[PDB]
Amino acid sequence: RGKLIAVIGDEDTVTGFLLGGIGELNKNRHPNFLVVEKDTTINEIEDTFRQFLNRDDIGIILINQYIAEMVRHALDAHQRSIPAVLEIPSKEHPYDAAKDSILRRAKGMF
Amino acid sequence: KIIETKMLMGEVMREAAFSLAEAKFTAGDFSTTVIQNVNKAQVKIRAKKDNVAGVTLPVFEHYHEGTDSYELTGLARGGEQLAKLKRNYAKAVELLVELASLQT
Amino acid sequence: SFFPELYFNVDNGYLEGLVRGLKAGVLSQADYLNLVQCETLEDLKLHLQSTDYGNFLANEASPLTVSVIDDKLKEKMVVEFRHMRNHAYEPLASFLDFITYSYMIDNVILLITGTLHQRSIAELVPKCHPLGSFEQMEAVNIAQTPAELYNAILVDTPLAAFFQDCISEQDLDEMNIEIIRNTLYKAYLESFYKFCTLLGGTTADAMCPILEFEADRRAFIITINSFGTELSKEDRAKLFPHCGRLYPEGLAQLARADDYEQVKNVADYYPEYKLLFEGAGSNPGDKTLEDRFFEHEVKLNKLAFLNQFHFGVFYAFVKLKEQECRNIVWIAECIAQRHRAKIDNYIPIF
């Protein structure tokens, strides 16, 4: 009931989670997810990311790492706790490690 | 602990991503149906408070709402691979839920 | 009979030579091994260029991804099919239309659901499988009205006859989308099978075994996968094609079955199938039932190329090349994700 998880990622990443049972339509027929294709621009990704931050329905947002780099300014600009954002490795992009927002918040971690 | 979890997340998501490849191999193009045919969630997250010390911290808790996921045997009837795929990502979500709580 | 081997080559002589010439270009076991020894997607491209494949990823993005090579492989065989479909005459063209029908069915399932959840046709068409095409209007610009799509289909779309099972629109809204598509496909198999038997020569004898397999193979898998879901046993039985070896007696047992063990007991009566269930060890790190079925289906489609005067060579061609695409994508995907121990899960096509 309480909170949904929003997913912004590529076709395979979003498909996997949807089968994972997470993700649904809102009462206004809006979807708490975005599939990011090669033809999707920066403004559309950022507008979606922000709108989730301004929605109380979501909370945890799941994004691909390569996306985190595409709209990185929007990830550091908002510092709160609702929008817990987790950065995950895409099917082909390799294991994430660097440029993690949280790893940066703490500068005492290997 | 958050670092070890981040490390584990890598391995778990890798396995889930591979499982998707197998489901696609058998089924063909199931991603189109899954993405378009979305209505209600089976997984939802309930907020809970953890009194770690004088400071009170917000923690997420996994809630298995119970609404059934879509059953798809339409393409090559690749049901078993999709069923294993559901399980692998289901587990992935549970790890990620824990992960979000740890960022707190 | 004396039915073929006489008039057949008058119109279909060229296509028979061409399609078998195209078959010659399918990756051999020797070629698959050369493709495995890559570990790099760019090297995969380079090794593919040694065959009839290649030079089709040129002028694309410098980094090669799996999604790109997948789409391109489909496109190559679509062009080859459309070429053979266009250079053809009614006696053969009708056969090919049935093949395209299987893809049209999937595409109209995509058009509905989206129509039921207000999505525009123009947004849906780009993600329809090729060969669906739908050059006809009225299916386009339906104004997101289910009635307009159901009227355009009934009238203009060749699949109209098949929808006789699922009609009045009420069916579209009340039936689960998957029951609708499985029902429609069953109707397709029934008509297509009968069509093959009307062509009561070599085609019927070479082609029907393949369709009979598909009917029984789907009946088996449907029964198993349906165990964990909510579906009336009678409604499940309604989805079983009657063009197969289980139809006389056997489907009745699958319709009642509530467990894998009972399904195997049904297979036990058919050694051709029993071997598949016994071979499908289904261990946590082994091949499963779907994998053995694919191997069997390829055997059947390859045996189709042992008759030189029929239409079954064209059907088998499409399915074998479609599996060829699955095999190539599998290799590309295994490379990208570095799971080298799982590379030998492709279906050999000889």
UniProtKB/Swiss-Prot annotation, chain A:
GO terms for biological process: synaptic vesicle lumen acidification. Belongs to the V-ATPase F subunit family. V-ATPase is a heteromultimeric enzyme made up of two complexes: the ATP-hydrolytic V1 complex and the proton translocation V0 complex. The V1 complex consists of three catalytic AB heterodimers that form a heterohexamer, three peripheral stalks each consisting of EG heterodimers, one central rotor including subunits D and F, and the regulatory subunits C and H. The proton translocation complex V0 consists of the proton transport subunit a, a ring of proteolipid subunits c9c'', rotary subunit d, subunits e and f, and the accessory subunits ATP6AP1/Ac45 and ATP6AP2/PRR. PANTHER family: V-TYPE PROTON ATPASE SUBUNIT F (PTHR13861:SF2), VACUOLAR ATP SYNTHASE SUBUNIT F (PTHR13861). It is a peripheral membrane protein. InterPro entries: ATPase_V1-cplx_f_g_su, ATPase_V1-cplx_fsu_euk, ATPase_V1_fsu_sf. It is found in: Cytoplasmic vesicle, Secretory vesicle, Synaptic vesicle membrane; Cytoplasmic vesicle, Clathrin-coated vesicle membrane. Keywords: Cytoplasmic vesicle, Hydrogen ion transport, Ion transport, Membrane, Synapse, Transport. Expressed in brain (at protein level). Subunit of the V1 complex of vacuolar(H+)-ATPase (V-ATPase), a multisubunit enzyme composed of a peripheral complex (V1) that hydrolyzes ATP and a membrane integral complex (V0) that translocates protons. V-ATPase is responsible for acidifying and maintaining the pH of intracellular compartments and in some cell types, is targeted to the plasma membrane, where it is responsible for acidifying the extracellular environment. GO terms for molecular function: proton-transporting ATPase activity, rotational mechanism. One of its GO terms (cellular component) is clathrin-coated vesicle membrane. This is V-type proton ATPase subunit F.
